[PDB]
PDB file of C-alpha atoms in Angstrom:
ATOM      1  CA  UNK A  23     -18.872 -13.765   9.491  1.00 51.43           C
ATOM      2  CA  UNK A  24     -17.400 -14.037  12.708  1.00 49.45           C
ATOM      3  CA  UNK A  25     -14.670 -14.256   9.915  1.00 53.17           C
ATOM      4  CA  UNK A  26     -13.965 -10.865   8.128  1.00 56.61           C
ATOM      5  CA  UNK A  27     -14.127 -12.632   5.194  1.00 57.13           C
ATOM      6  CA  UNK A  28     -15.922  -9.428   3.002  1.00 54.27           C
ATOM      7  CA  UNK A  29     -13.702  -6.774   4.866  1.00 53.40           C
ATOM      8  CA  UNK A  30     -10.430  -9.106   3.808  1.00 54.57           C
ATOM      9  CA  UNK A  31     -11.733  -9.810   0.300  1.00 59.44           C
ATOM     10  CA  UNK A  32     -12.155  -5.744  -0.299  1.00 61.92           C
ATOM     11  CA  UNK A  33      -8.922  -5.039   1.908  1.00 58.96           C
ATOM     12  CA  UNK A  34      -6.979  -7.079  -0.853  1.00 57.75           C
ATOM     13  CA  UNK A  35      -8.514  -5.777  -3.355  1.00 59.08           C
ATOM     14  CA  UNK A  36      -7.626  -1.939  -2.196  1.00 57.26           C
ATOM     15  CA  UNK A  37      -4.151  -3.189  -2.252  1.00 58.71           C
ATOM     16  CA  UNK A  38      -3.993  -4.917  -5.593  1.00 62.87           C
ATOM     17  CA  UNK A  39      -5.348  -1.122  -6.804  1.00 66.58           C
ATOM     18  CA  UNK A  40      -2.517   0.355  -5.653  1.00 66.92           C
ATOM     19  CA  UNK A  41      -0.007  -2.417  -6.399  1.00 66.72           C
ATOM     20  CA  UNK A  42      -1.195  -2.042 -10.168  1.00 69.26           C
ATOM     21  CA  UNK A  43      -1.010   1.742  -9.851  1.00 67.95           C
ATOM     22  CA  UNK A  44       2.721   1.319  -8.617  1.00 68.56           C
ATOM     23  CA  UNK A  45       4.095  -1.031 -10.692  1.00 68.64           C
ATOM     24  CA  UNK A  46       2.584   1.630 -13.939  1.00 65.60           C
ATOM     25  CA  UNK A  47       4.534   4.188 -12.038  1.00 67.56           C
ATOM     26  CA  UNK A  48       6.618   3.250  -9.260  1.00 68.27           C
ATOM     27  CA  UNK A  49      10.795   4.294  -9.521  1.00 66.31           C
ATOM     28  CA  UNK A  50      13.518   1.718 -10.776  1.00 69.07           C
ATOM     29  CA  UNK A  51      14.688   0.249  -6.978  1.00 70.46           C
ATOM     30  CA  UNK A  52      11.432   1.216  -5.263  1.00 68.47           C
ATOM     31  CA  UNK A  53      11.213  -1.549  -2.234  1.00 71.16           C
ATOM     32  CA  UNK A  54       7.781  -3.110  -1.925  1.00 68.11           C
ATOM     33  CA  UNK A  55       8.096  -3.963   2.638  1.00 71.08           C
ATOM     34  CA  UNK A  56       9.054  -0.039   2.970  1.00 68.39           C
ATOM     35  CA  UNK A  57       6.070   1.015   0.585  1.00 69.53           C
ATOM     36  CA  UNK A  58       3.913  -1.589   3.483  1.00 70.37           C
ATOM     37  CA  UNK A  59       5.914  -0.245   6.394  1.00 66.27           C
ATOM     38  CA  UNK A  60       4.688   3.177   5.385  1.00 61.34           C
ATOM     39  CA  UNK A  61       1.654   2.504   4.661  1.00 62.01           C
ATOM     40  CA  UNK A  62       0.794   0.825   7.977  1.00 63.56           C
ATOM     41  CA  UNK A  63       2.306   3.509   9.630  1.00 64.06           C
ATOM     42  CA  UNK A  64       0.657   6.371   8.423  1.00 63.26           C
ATOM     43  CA  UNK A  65      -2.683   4.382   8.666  1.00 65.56           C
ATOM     44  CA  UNK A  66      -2.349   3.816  12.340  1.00 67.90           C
ATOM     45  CA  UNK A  67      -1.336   7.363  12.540  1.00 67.61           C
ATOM     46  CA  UNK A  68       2.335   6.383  13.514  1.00 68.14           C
ATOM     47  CA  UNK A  69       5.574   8.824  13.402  1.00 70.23           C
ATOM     48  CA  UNK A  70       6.930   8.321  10.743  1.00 70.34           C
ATOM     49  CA  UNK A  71      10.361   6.192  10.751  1.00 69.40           C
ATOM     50  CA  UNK A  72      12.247   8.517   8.441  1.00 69.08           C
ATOM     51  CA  UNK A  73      12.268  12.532   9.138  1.00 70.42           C
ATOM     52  CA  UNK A  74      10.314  14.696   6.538  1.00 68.80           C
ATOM     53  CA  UNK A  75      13.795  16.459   5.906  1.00 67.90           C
ATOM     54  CA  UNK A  76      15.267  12.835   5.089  1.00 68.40           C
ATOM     55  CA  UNK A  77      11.860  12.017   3.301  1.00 71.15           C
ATOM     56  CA  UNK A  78      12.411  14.976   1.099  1.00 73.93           C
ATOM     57  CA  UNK A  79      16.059  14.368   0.160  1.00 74.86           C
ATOM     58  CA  UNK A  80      14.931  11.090  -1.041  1.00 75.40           C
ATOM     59  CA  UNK A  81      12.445  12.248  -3.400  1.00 73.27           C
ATOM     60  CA  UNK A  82      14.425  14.597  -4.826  1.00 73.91           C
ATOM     61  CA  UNK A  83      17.366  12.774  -5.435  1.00 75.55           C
ATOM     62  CA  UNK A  84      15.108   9.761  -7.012  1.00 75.45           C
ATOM     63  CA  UNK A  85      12.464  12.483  -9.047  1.00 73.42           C
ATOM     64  CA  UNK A  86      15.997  12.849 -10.914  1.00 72.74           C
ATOM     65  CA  UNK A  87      15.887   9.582 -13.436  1.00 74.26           C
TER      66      UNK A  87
ATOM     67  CA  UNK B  23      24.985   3.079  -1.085  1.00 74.42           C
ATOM     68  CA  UNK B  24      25.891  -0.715  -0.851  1.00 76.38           C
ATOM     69  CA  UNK B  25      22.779   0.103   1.181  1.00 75.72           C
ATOM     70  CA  UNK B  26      19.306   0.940  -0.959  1.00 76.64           C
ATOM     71  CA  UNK B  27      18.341   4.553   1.590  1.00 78.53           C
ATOM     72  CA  UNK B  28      17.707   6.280  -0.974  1.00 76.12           C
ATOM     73  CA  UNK B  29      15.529   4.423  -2.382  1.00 80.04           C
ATOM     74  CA  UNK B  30      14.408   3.003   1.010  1.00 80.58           C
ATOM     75  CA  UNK B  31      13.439   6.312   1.857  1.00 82.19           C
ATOM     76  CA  UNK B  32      11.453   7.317  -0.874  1.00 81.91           C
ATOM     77  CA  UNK B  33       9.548   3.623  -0.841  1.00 86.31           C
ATOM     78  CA  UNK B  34       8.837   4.782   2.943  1.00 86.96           C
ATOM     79  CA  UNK B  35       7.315   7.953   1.787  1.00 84.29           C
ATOM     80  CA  UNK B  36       5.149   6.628  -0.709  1.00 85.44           C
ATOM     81  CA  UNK B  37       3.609   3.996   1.361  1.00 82.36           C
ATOM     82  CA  UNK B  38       2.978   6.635   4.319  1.00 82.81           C
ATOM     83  CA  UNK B  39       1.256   8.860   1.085  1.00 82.78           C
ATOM     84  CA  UNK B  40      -1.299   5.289   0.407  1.00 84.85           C
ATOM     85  CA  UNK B  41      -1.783   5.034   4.521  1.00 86.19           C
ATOM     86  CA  UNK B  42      -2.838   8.857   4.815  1.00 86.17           C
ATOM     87  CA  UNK B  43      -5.228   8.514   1.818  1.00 85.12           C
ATOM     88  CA  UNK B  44      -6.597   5.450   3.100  1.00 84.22           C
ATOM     89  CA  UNK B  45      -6.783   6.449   6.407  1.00 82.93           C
ATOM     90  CA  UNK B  46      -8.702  10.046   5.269  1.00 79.37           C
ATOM     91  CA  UNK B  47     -11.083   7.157   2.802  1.00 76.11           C
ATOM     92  CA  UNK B  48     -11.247   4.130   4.177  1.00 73.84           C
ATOM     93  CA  UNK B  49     -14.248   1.500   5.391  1.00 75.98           C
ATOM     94  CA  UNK B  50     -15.037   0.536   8.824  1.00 71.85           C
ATOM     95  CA  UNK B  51     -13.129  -3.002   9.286  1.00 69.92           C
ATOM     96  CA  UNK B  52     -10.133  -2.432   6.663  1.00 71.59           C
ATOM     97  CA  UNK B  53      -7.725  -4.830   6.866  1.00 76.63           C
ATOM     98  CA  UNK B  54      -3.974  -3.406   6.797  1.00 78.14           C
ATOM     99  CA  UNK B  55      -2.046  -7.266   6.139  1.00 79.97           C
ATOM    100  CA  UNK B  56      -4.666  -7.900   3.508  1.00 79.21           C
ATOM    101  CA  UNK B  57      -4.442  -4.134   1.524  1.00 76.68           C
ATOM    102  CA  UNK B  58       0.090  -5.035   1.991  1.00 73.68           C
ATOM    103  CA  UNK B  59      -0.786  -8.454   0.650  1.00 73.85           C
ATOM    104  CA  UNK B  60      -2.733  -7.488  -2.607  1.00 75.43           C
ATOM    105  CA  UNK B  61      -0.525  -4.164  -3.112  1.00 73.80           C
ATOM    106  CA  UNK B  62       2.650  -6.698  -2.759  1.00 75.82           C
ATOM    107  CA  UNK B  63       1.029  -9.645  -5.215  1.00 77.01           C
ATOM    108  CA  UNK B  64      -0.210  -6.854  -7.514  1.00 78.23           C
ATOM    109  CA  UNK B  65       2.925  -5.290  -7.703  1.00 77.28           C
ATOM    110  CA  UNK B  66       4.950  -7.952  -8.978  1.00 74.83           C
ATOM    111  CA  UNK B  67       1.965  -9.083 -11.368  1.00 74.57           C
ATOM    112  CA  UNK B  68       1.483 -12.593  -8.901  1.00 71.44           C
ATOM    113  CA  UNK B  69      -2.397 -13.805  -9.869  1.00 71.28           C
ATOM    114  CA  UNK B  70      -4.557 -12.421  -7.499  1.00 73.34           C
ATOM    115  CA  UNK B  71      -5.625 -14.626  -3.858  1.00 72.14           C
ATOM    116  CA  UNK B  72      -9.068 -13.531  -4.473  1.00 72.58           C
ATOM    117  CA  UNK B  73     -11.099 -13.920  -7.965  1.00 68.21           C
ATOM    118  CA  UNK B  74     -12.567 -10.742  -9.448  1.00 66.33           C
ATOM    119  CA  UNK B  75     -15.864 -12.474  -8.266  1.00 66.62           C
ATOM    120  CA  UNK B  76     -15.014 -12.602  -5.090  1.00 70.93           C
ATOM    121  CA  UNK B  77     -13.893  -8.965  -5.386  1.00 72.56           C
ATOM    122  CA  UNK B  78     -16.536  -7.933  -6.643  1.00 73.32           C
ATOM    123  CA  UNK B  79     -19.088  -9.156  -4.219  1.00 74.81           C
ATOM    124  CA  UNK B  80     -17.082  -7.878  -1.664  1.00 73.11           C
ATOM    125  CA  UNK B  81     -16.933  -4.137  -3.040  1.00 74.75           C
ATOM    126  CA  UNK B  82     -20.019  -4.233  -3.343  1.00 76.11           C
ATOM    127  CA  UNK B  83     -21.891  -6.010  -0.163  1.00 77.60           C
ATOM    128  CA  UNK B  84     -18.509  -2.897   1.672  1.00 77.85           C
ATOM    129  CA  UNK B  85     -20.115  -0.280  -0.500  1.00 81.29           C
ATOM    130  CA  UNK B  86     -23.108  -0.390   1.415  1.00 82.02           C
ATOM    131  CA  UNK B  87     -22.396   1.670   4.433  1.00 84.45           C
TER     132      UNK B  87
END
């Protein structure tokens, strides 16, 4: 209680969500601490570390399998 | 190339996509090291920390706003 213990039980539990939805369909070399890294930062409302321009690049070049 | 940016990039991007979504729907007291620890375990199909008793009890004792 003075523990989080329910918030940190349902906090995982978000995550393994989205971990299962990702590894259904993530991208052949997609790199699990930069899928956290983001994450964190655009929950804390952060700037993000890569540009949108550089962002967009990215996703284009991988959408091509 | 050696180097993974592409794919580094686009990694970056999704995770910042989960952080905006969870940030827009999240729960008073989310935990972001927990959510990066179940996304991580569920990813690479590691048994989860928490039983889905546990996880359940949670979601549901959360749900209640």
């Amino acid at each position: 209680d003075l523990f989080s213990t329910m918030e940190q039980h349902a906090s995982y539990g978000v995550g393994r969500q989205m971990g299962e939805q990702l590894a259904a369909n993530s991208f052949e070399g997609i790199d699990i601490p930069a899928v956290q890294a983001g994450l964190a930062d655009a929950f804390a409302g952060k700037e993000s570390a890569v540009s949108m321009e550089e962002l967009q690049v990215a996703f284009t070049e991988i959408s091509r399998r």
